[PDB]
Design a protein around this ligand. Structure first.
Ligand SMILES: [Zn+2]
Lengths: 59, 84
């Protein structure tokens, strides 16, 4: 599993389905947003679409 | 929004349990909004939900979960976890 280098979205894809940036296997932490509209944590994380995200990522 | 709870898990099973939780939340249509597993918080998963009952139903019979920490967690105690 990889994470978008820009938005941290988690995927097996080498390219983020949201923002088209490269993804990396080198990621840490897990935030699963089930309901972006109702999640205060998602809002603090700048997440507005459902999915799973890393907390930090590097190349 | 409001309620966030810490769910105690086995150390090292945090992400695994977050995954099972998300699946169960969707399947059972529970009012669970997000699930957070921070590396700096071993043995616990944080669950944002409408009520404590949602979290009780979420973890009901789930392996490798020990229970729910008493009391809600304030959003300010969580924010530092967002940028590791
Ligand atoms: Zn992205």
């Amino acid at each position: 599993m990889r994470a978008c280098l820009k938005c941290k979205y988690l995927t097996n894809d080498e390219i983020c389905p949201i923002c088209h940036s490269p993804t990396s296997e080198n990621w840490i932490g897990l935030l699963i947003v089930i309901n972006p509209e109702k999640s205060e944590i998602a809002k603090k994380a700048g997440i507005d679409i459902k999915g799973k995200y890393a907390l930090s990522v590097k190349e | 929004a409001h309620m966030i709870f810490a769910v105690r898990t086995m150390v090292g099973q945090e992400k695994n349990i977050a995954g099972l939780m998300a699946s169960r939340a969707e399947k059972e249509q529970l009012d669970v909004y997000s699930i957070l597993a921070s590396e700096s918080l071993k043995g616990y998963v944080l669950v944002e939900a409408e009520t404590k009952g949602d979290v009780e139903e979420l973890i009901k019979g789930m392996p490798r979960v020990r229970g729910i920490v008493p009391g809600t967690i304030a959003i300010e105690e969580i924010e530092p976890l967002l940028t590791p």
